[PDB]
Write an enzyme that holds these catalytic residues in place. Structure first.
Site, PDB file in Angstrom:
ATOM      1  N   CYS A 116      -6.404  41.158 -24.230  1.00  0.00           N
ATOM      2  CA  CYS A 116      -6.983  40.342 -25.360  1.00  0.00           C
ATOM      3  C   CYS A 116      -5.924  39.391 -25.689  1.00  0.00           C
ATOM      4  CB  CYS A 116      -7.281  41.382 -26.571  1.00  0.00           C
ATOM      5  SG  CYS A 116      -8.126  40.623 -27.897  1.00  0.00           S
ATOM      6  N   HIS A 168     -10.401  45.297 -23.918  1.00  0.00           N
ATOM      7  CA  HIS A 168      -9.619  46.596 -23.774  1.00  0.00           C
ATOM      8  C   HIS A 168      -9.950  47.612 -22.670  1.00  0.00           C
ATOM      9  CE1 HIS A 168      -8.407  44.923 -27.954  1.00  0.00           C
ATOM     10  NE2 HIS A 168      -7.199  45.160 -27.391  1.00  0.00           N
ATOM     11  N   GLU A 193      -8.449  49.930 -21.465  1.00  0.00           N
ATOM     12  CA  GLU A 193      -7.891  51.304 -21.465  1.00  0.00           C
ATOM     13  C   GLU A 193      -8.716  52.325 -22.280  1.00  0.00           C
ATOM     14  OE1 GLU A 193      -6.718  48.267 -22.644  1.00  0.00           O
ATOM     15  OE2 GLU A 193      -5.910  48.315 -24.592  1.00  0.00           O
TER      16      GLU A 193
END
Ligand code: CTP
Ligand code: CTP
Ligand code: CTP
Ligand code: CTP
Ligand code: CTP
Ligand code: CTP
Ligand code: MG
Ligand code: MG
Ligand code: MG
Ligand code: MG
Ligand code: MG
Ligand code: MG
Lengths: 557, 557, 557
Positions: free
Chosen positions: A399, A526, A528
């Site tokens: 990001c 993102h 994750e």
């Protein structure tokens, strides 16, 4: 539907969340479709207000909910994708009952905590337990409910009273109660003390629930004299007193609960479809925890972060690196850098912290610049990105770390050095990163690019496309207003930084790769939040493959 | 009179007894005449029934009370000699109210827990707080009351209700409340949790008492964020939240409380005669605790005991050796031997434990054979006494260890080998140790020699007479039925074992010394009950002087 | 064995004792052998110390136990004869655990309220529930246990903790819990308030028991909105919420509980041998309560009592007169006279009370002089006995009233006016009533004539022999030291006072009848303790037969 409420007795930090997750993993491994709810008795309606140093990371759901990092633990331990309303809060429940009062849905009656707040908690639990949360369309079988705070807290009173009523709406053979409690021991005698468990279970019975398992948090395994004394005061059998003593890994907690025989008890108590069996999928969890204790080879990465210390500000960023390091059979070493301590400015005021940050950055096998917002730490992030590029180090920008990696390549590699952001320096002479909010019918003004979006590959010549399985596009989670300026994309096409991922509208460029480098990539999503212990998120897997030097061998399979 | 009630919040093992003792030592050091009471909410009326492996040692008072070992801690930390009724028990209080009901002292009213059990606790506290307990004849100024168990226990209910009423009989400026609580911390976060303190203080307010200090038991010193949060829930100022974290010595706990400024608070709260001052006698305690951390030279002694392990079976025997080792600037090493493991018989069934016991005995700088009753361990004690005599090792025999040291000298040194006890082998051919109970007007049958008795020296030629300051006689505490046979004393006068101490009636021989040995003595009294941290009990001081080799130099001063 | 614990919630006076009795009567009427226990959490070991103005009457059992008047209610409502250990007290339980500690029965362990006081309560309940208490030799089927005081009392804590453990020793299908609670209503709104029931049931769950019925004590029948709200907080079904509103008679309370359908619930919950049936013996109770509301004809008797007012000093004397008046279809009017107010002496100090007492005595259809001890009221009793004899009024003298009726016939009818007692005027010139205690092997000194004894009729010419069914002898309960002097019996044989009952040893004269009178009798036993609602005690039946004038017609059947 079967329901498992998980409650905490003595103190809030005993690990209710790893118990409830591991119960969920166990029942998932037995072949049941498991959903999970968390009650956060705080007044925040969502996580979007949190400054990540306080409370921790904001987790993003497929639906665009900004939710507690604790719901990310349920997404990792169970293969599920939660909706925003699997997080229940005091803010949500009170806001919902207030709104129904303003509309007159309560027919001009006095709206009261009992019944009306407590009925709202039970309506919300029955409604969300029915929502499918796996890939399968069929409704769940068990809901695991975790209740935050401890018994006797004011904030938890409307939820324990809701579950006191609820265990009669859901029959006995459907509702079940896990009480997690502290069994302390002192350094002098070394005796495990059942007394806080006794007093918190007395309080839980007063509030109207009665334990069906007791899970003891303790610094070493509880003895049978403890199991029998807890059984004597708490109305459970001694086989229904478990302990989870402090251990090497969260991946081991499910495996300790299967050793403590909880599957047999849930088959008896909840009449579960499991059957008697010699096997369930927890052997894959048992392998992963026995792998994790065998990790000897270090793989060490620099995380250039927006905050003064890690409590949980990057909690799923860390877990995505751990899943990737486990999958690559290395022990992750996470060299956290408070990004401001890389700035050339700080040497005029604290040179000891300045040299310490640069020594830690110079150790790196790879660099991770994670997401964030604001001016703070951006200059220090830029110095680490430019270190990563110039000193040929493997790199992932997430990001903000991607926006800064477009910016510094314009500044330092196109010599467009008046190029800057719009969140920082909003007056920029050539605004290379710009505010570009999502806009739709049925919404007022511009809004965040928030939740799951399709990002499409521009080329077959991408390392991320290879790590994603050579698929045409990916769906991944986003949380930003800002983007690279679509009009300034032309300045890149002569030179080494490519764009390789794009939105389905074409309006936004969402993945970059730098050529002539081991691995240097940035993503707007993102990755994750989509990561799972059994299967890492490809951008983090690529970063840790590249860090040890395995990426050029992994691409051969 | 001023009163300090000390109560426990969370779990029973937090050290209420060292807090209450150290509060007492502090106020004693300020120049106040301090008395102490302990409430044991158990139904035992006295300690005389206790098997010392369970609960611990039986402590003997000057008056002949058999009392809890915890009242021995108040006798060590304050220079006082308690009466049996400074121990209050549920057994004592209920037995006293039952006896008054049988006599009709309650005027044919229904006798009830409230008021009549609770009035008995308050009558007993006001009556015993007025009894002088120092050498001075003048009445006490402060009573320190320790209440056993934790708040919310059934057993403690009649005593917290007694103190709820009592804080209005004694005015506000006379009654004061110390609440000792657990502040736990977990190994992962390292955060000190105030929640059990909050919940136990809420319960203490319900039961009707309110803290005036909070003392936190914790594994490390509490932070100010803990002091302020405890203050926010518990209605104390943050300077009135103390901690006693786990430390090197009980001698340091008074010294930590003076650093935490409790003297200033008691002068304010109890309007105490102390005055403002730059000094109080706690500098002598501060020296002793700073000595104790500097003890490097080992002095190692074998204690040949009647029990399978030390919990507290020899708790004051150990403390008398520690006072003596501190006074001799050595670290005591207490090699405990479960006496049965020296017996030649055990090598036929567990030879590993047999060789282990004899290796530990062979290390010894000195041997201590402590008191007891019954056949058990006597044969193993005899083998260690005869080792001590033959291998020229320093020796103290206490009560049973003295009776066995008369027996083995008749067996092995007079060749009277048919000589034996009467508690063991009651049919003995030549009964050298005999049942000889005390008998008086106003008593039914024969009774124990129990409590303080004058023992008179027979000769100036005694090492114990020198260690006792060359005084004509001593007063010391006894607890036995049995004695050396007065008719068989003639067989000793030709040979090396002398008798040097005798009863004032002449009927009983009470101290022995073996000639031609560094130090070998036995006493019928228990000298450890009379021992104090600032001034050791002479028989133990002599044993540890002789152990390192200092006795022949100490006799020169 | 099946067990019914009856507990009280809100306030102690709600009628736990009539609920527990009526539950017992119900289960007795279904054909079950029912035993009953009462816990009195007071420290009195027995009732013998009670001054009857405080607490009430002392009830005497067949075995010679002096017990609470509340165990007389269980003897009236169930056809049973209790042993002294069906009364459990805090005094009894603590005295028993103390005695076991002194003997060393607890093996030198610390004796504690939990487990050792709580184990003593459970051992005592299992042991006494097994004792046969009907005429049948076979063991009981249900034990009804009533626990005194209210939930949250300190005195009740060791007994609720005993029953918390006990409901797992006795299985679920054997242990059952009745909670009796106050549902108040205020005069303004007229709304029945469930809140004290909610809070006392929360406390009962904390203490670890959970209701199986709730019985509401209320000033009018509870509405269904109350039954449903109590069910919503208390975890009982709305059919398991009963009320017993205040009513005409205790004989109606069993009949209200059968209307509220408790028999069906106990058959389900305790798996009882009852079977489904259209009838049980409660139709005989239903008749008696519908008789009691139809009693219109007055029968009015003077009770010349030793006390300033009735709370309960004559509670079973009153019930024996009520059983007799019901059996004779008259409403009893009990004109109580504080006996001292008949004395000629009192007119010199309170003449208004003196004339008031004599007006009430002059109304009488019959006179009852009940038992007692001491000088007090004896002179006033004598004036009423002599009024009864001279003015030709029907008369019953019980214990003291019989001794005084031998005395006044010697004084006024033999002109032996120096004749007097030995409890009052112990120096008497001619001691006509004397101290004559029972003496036996295995007892120390002389003891009371206490409990059930055989009294043998001397003649067929006795009205009491006719009222007792023309039987050769009776067994009845005694409680006295004193007797008529056996040597002075000769002075009576010429004159109108006969002796008609005698001890089996011959040593004691135990019944008198005065000739030429409608009915004038005295007994040394207390016939009221043997009295039952379905079958009156013959001396009281004779007194109330004679009072209306029916005795000469009753002797014809
Ligand atoms: N399913 C889970 C649960 C917990 N954790 C880890 O455990 C920590 C939080 O533990 P948790 O089980 O949530 O208990 P606490 O947060 O300590 O306290 P609470 O009982 O309030 O949850 C987090 O840092 C997280 O990394 C995890 O990885 N996966
Ligand atoms: N509701 C209860 C439970 C226990 N006790 C008392 O608790 C004492 C034991 O104290 P402690 O060891 O602190 O309690 P444990 O039950 O052993 O619990 P832990 O395992 O924490 O020691 C006993 O004397 C017993 O009378 C009590 O008063 N009330
Ligand atoms: N005045 C004191 C008090 C305690 N101790 C030591 O501390 C231990 C007992 O600690 P205490 O303060 O009595 O607390 P606990 O017994 O652990 O628990 P409680 O709070 O019930 O006393 C004993 O072994 C004793 O050696 C001591 O030497 N002197
Ligand atoms: N009577 C109280 C006190 C506190 N809280 C809640 O407690 C939560 C904090 O939990 P925890 O950290 O477990 O409590 P602390 O007060 O911080 O205590 P500790 O020092 O033990 O953490 C807050 O959300 C607050 O709403 C509550 O519900 N009722
Ligand atoms: N089996 C019973 C029970 C009670 N009563 C009458 O009811 C009164 C006592 O009521 P009880 O049911 O014992 O309740 P209380 O004594 O008012 O209060 P508690 O709940 O403590 O018993 C007595 O005067 C007695 O005459 C009775 O006749 N027979
Ligand atoms: N554990 C509970 C139960 C009820 N209420 C509150 O109780 C109020 C109603 O008050 P009241 O009428 O006094 O309680 P009821 O439950 O109606 O009981 P009662 O029959 O005694 O009125 C409601 O606003 C509800 O929020 C509460 O705060 N906590
Ligand atoms: Mg959590
Ligand atoms: Mg314990
Ligand atoms: Mg102690
Ligand atoms: Mg906290
Ligand atoms: Mg009663
Ligand atoms: Mg209401």
């Amino acid at each position: 539907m079967k329901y498992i409420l998980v409650t905490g007795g003595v103190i809030s930090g005993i690990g209710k969340g790893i118990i409830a997750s591991s119960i969920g993993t166990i029942l998932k491994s037995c072949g049941l479709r498991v959903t999970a709810i968390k009650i956060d008795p705080y007044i925040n309606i969502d996580a979007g207000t949190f400054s990540p140093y306080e409370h921790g990371e904001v987790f993003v759901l497929n639906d665009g909910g900004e939710v507690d990092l604790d719901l990310g633990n349920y997404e990792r331990f169970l293969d599920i994708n939660l909706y925003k309303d699997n997080n229940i809060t005091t803010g949500k429940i009170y806001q919902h009952v207030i709104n129904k009062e303003r509309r007159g849905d309560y027919l001009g009656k006095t709206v009261q905590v009992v019944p009306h707040i407590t009925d709202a908690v039970q309506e919300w639990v029955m409604n969300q337990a029915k929502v499918p949360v796996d890939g399968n369309k069929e409704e769940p079988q068990i809901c695991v409910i975790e209740l935050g705070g401890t018994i006797g807290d004011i904030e938890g009173m409307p939820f324990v009273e809701a579950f006191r009523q609820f265990q009669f709406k859901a029959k006995r053979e459907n509702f079940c109660n896990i009480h997690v409690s502290l069994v302390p021991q002192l350094s002098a005698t070394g005796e495990q003390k059942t007394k806080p468990t006794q007093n918190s279970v007395r309080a839980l019975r007063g509030l109207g629930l009665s334990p069906d398992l007791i899970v003891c948090r303790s610094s070493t395994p509880i003895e049978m004299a403890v199991k029998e004394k807890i059984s004597m005061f708490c109305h459970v059998n001694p086989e229904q007193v478990i302990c989870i003593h402090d251990v090497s890994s969260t991946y081991r907690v499910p495996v300790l609960l299967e050793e403590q025989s909880i599957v047999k008890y849930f088959k008896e108590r909840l009449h579960l479809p499991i059957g008697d069996s010699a096997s369930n999928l927890l052997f894959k969890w048992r392998n992963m925890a026995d792998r994790y204790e065998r990790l000897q080879k270090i793989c060490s990465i620099a995380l250039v972060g927006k905050y003064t210390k890690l409590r949980d500000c990057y909690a799923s960023v860390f877990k995505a690196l751990e899943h990737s390091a486990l999958a690559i059979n290395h022990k992750l070493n996470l060299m956290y850098i408070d990004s401001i301590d890389l700035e050339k400015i700080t040497e005029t005021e604290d040179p000891v912290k300045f040299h310490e940050a640069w020594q830690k950055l110079c150790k790196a096998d790879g660099i991770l610049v994670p997401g964030g917002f604001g001016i703070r730490g951006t200059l220090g992030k830029l110095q680490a990105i430019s270190w990563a590029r110039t000193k040929k180090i493997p790199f992932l920008g997430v990001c903000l770390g991607m926006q800064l990696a477009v910016i510094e390549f314009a500044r330092n590699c196109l010599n467009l050095k008046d190029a800057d952001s719009t969140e920082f320096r909003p007056n920029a002479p050539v605004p290379l990163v710009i505010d570009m909010p999502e806009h739709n019918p049925g919404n007022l003004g511009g809004t965040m690019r928030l939740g799951i979006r399709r990002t499409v590959f521009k080329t077959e010549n991408s390392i991320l496309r290879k790590l994603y399985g050579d698929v045409p596009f990916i769906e991944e989670r986003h949380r930003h207003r800002f983007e690279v300026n679509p009009n300034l994309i032309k300045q890149f096409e002569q030179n080494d930084l490519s764009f390789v991922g794009q939105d389905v509208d074409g309006d936004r460029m969402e993945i970059i790769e730098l050529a002539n480098h081991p691995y240097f990539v940035g993503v707007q999503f993102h990755p994750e939040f989509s990561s799972r212990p059994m299967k890492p998120s490809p951008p983090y897997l690529g970063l840790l493959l590249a860090a040890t030097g395995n990426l050029n061998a992994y691409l051969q399979q």
